[PDB]
Structure formats: structure tokens, C-alpha cells
């Protein structure tokens, strides 16, 4: 573009689009469970991914992954959403925070406990 053109139209600044309308551009949002279904993977992968429809306080109704070996989520259980998609589950854009509200932490988690919100086991 000519200098005179740049003067006329000028460069357009790039806009990024959010990937997590957890609204309020908040770090976390709490919602209520609606359906504790179990979706199936995509392209190659196969298994029974545990998911959950959630009615957020942000006014949005979303689907969220439930990390961990085994959960305890039910129909009207209160939960916290943290944002983070799941490559295999088209339509799931947030993970559920384990160890907060109604979502109990993972039992027998002896490693990456910071995630899977499980307290420090007392070594006998």
C-alpha cells in the first residue's frame, strides 16, 4: 500500500475473539448441573467421556468435562466451571473444577492432586 494510501485507510488492528464466554470474562463461573450424560469421542478416540450440562450464573447453559477417574455429580449439583476445551468432545468448552461445591475430588489420587482437588493423604 502506498504511503498516501496508508494515510487514507491505514492499518487495521487485529481483534481476537474469546474462546470462553464464561461471561464477565471471569476466571470461573458456577452453575447447576442439568444432565450428567456421557458422550463418545471423535475421529479416532473411543471411550465414555463424562460430561455435564450446566446452567451458569452468567445466564449461559453449557456442557463441561468432568476430569478424574470417577465423579459424584448428579442432576441438581452445584459446580464450578474453569474453561478449557476437550479436543475429542465437540461442544465442550470448559472443565469442571473438582473439589469445589458439589463436585467431590477424586478418591485415591496420589499424584497431580492440585488438579482433581484431593487433600494430602496422611502417610500411615
Amino acid at each position: 500500500p502506498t504511503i498516501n494510501q496508508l494515510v487514507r485507510k491505514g492499518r487495521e488492528k487485529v481483534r481476537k475473539k474469546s474462546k470462553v464466554p464464561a461471561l464477565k470474562g471471569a476466571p470461573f463461573r458456577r452453575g447447576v448441573c442439568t444432565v450428567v450424560r456421557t458422550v463418545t469421542p471423535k475421529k479416532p478416540n473411543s471411550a465414555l467421556r463424562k460430561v455435564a450440562k450446566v446452567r451458569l450464573t452468567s445466564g449461559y447453559e453449557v456442557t463441561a468435562y468432568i476430569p478424574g477417574e470417577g465423579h459424584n455429580l448428579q442432576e441438581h449439583s452445584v459446580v464450578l466451571i474453569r474453561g478449557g476445551r476437550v479436543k475429542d468432545l465437540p461442544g465442550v468448552r470448559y472443565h469442571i473444577v473438582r473439589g469445589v461445591y458439589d463436585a467431590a475430588g477424586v478418591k485415591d489420587r496420589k499424584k497431580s492432586r492440585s488438579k482433581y482437588g484431593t487433600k494430602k493423604p496422611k502417610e500411615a
Binding site: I3, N4, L6, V7
Partner: protein, 104 residues
Amino acid sequence: PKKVLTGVVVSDKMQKTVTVLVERQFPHPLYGKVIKRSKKYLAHDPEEKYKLGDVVEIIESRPISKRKRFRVLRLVESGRMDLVEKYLIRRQNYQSLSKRGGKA
């Protein structure tokens, strides 16, 4: 210093008032080239002296009316519509570029 400006009378259609078209130049703050903008001032002409085409010196004054804070200090050079033309011709293109389009 009461600001003094020079421009052309592009309009003598009002009573005791004239429209002076003051031109201005300067370097673009980011691209540096010298660009040239322009503004119209309504100046007070009591004697109804100044006529369409005159180059005049405008002087910062005490408000005379709303949208009118300048008085015709003096005449710099009479007659020269070559300038009024640009201004009018430009007003003429406006007469379009909307739902129709400006001539050429």
C-alpha cells in the same frame, strides 16, 4: 496574542457576516507527510465591506453571535475566485455520493 488568520471569503450570503475559509498545513503525527486541512470561520463584516473572493485577515474577537468569534481585520488581496471555485466545486460533489453519485 489575539490569534490572527488568513483565508478567503467563500460566502457573502449573510448580513454583516462572511464565511472565511482558512487553510492550514502540518506534518501528520505518525506518517510525517505534510497534510493540509481547512476550516471555515464566520467573521463579522459590519460595513458589509468584504466581498466574495477576497483574501482577508481574521482576528480573534469577543463573541458577536453563537458560532462567530472573529472579525475581519483587513484585506490582503482582492478578487480571486480561483479559490472560491475549489470550495464550491467540492460542495458540488457532495450533491451526490449518497444514493446517486458525484459527477466528474
